[PDB]
């Protein structure tokens, strides 16, 4: 490919390029979740900057992929982006949920990564997804499951009341 | 009128004159919203502090448009300020309510004036609106529809509680 | 729409979606180009930074209108996100060029937008696209030319040579 | 070996020895490229230090292997060291090309040894070559990747020209 690639396979070419475009549709996402939080007819505003900051998270996720794939002498290569599953989230509880099953998704295809490195003996992909994203998408997932727990806790007693007192003292704002 | 006027149709000087008296009513309202918030037997400060606050607001949104008649070479003309709509506001969901009318009803009036400049073409008063009135308006609309929205999350649940909580930990005091 | 949407009409509304699209689709063109220029074989980091940069400035664009969306009762909706037009952008003249077209693209559909405001009498909306938008794309728009000059200049006399001045000398790195 | 020695084979202990002596013989390799380029006929000093620097860099690489072959309870052993393969190393352009091949057959040995360590069950070797060793290697091979691209589009130009301004342009001094 370049006078730099060296152990840099076509299939993990391949799969970084599939996983910017995995982080970019996250982030497009939160995105679409942050701002549906900022509606007058919904109106929480921590919710909003929670998934705000999901969304450059994500960016910057993508942002790391793409300097490692020039790094290694890959191509960069990039995919219509699909918009979110939804237009509207429903209540944090359910938006939670639906943020669950999108990081975990994300966990699965680093994993999924991960063990194509390793089954292409690439220490270095390996190395770089265990630096950057296996262990903050552990700890994010953990903290999700967390705040699904409160919000559970909480709507099951006022539903109303609940996200309220949720987004005023566990979210930042 | 004037050595200095140059652009400034009768029209649109009776129309700030008649502005200056709606920012000067909403004040007024706001002054009675808030202080029926301080009486012992509603007893919600953080709410009495919001509508204080909105009636400086009004109060100076009138001396901006009495500073720009002068600056035009027009000439005040103060009429009776009529008392408030209601002498008692009801619950804090009430009040939002009230405002956010009183708010529409501000912001019809400022749109109106926009387009009588526009037929008028007048481009400083439209500029002057755009600058100091409108995008400000929108905000606060904003604003309030967000509270009301929480108001109505909150006193769904438990009323009292409700009213209760959403002075303490949304607003200032 | 909503408790708060005053004078904010259905073409607007959809308008502003579609905006956000572009401003999105231009923001992750200019995330393709930036990387491009990050290749081992291009490498012009000051060319990478200047796109990335601008890549950011198109998402908080968009974002900014998202923003007003909800603050005028509107609804966000997203599509899909199409890819770049190119997967290589060749050289620096060809990549600025590129870029000039993308950003007189945006300022059309902004100019129509304002075209759209005015003739739905939208003062706010006109206001918000003059305050925000339309004196930033002009003076981007006049940076971008006088980089293409610079580069026409420099490239003319010797390509390679003038393509590391320009990186060097113009661009900040 | 050792009242410490544990889960460390002889096969990586004598694999680290001679990873240790590659290291040297690149730190002398660079040493030899730095004083050519101070040359008084040659004299590009941005180029020399350049050089000199990788020379630390990789006496450092060879250190801290050492280190670690002591904290396993390896026993360090020193083989001759073979002078560089030039006496002189031609244009900048002739030297980047001959440190990106001597870079990559570091690469490739650091990617031996990182095979045999996970053949020989040892994940404190693979933990050490990967936080200290591979991802250096990669960041170090693509710079000077990006310098060879900037110098060849530079000296296809006008090589004199073009080598002054590299050096005083893109390396430091
Ligand atoms: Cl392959
Ligand atoms: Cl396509
Ligand atoms: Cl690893
Ligand atoms: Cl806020
Ligand atoms: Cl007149
Ligand atoms: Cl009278
Ligand atoms: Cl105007
Ligand atoms: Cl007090
Ligand atoms: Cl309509
Ligand atoms: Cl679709
Ligand atoms: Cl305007
Ligand atoms: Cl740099
Ligand atoms: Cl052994
Ligand atoms: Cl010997
Ligand atoms: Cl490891
Ligand atoms: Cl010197």
Known sequence: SSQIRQNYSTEVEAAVNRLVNLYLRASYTYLSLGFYFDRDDVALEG????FR???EEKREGA???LKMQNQRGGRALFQDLQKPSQDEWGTTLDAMK???????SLNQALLDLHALGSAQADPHLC???????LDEE????KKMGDHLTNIQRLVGSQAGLGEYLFERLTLKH
């Open 63 to 65: 942002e790391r992929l």
């Open 138 to 141: 552990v700890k994010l997932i």
């Open 98 to 104: 639906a943020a669950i099953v999108l990081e975990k």
């Open 47 to 50: 919710v909003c900057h929670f």
């Open 127 to 133: 190395d770089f997804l265990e630096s950057h994203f």
């Open 53 to 55: 900051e999901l969304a």
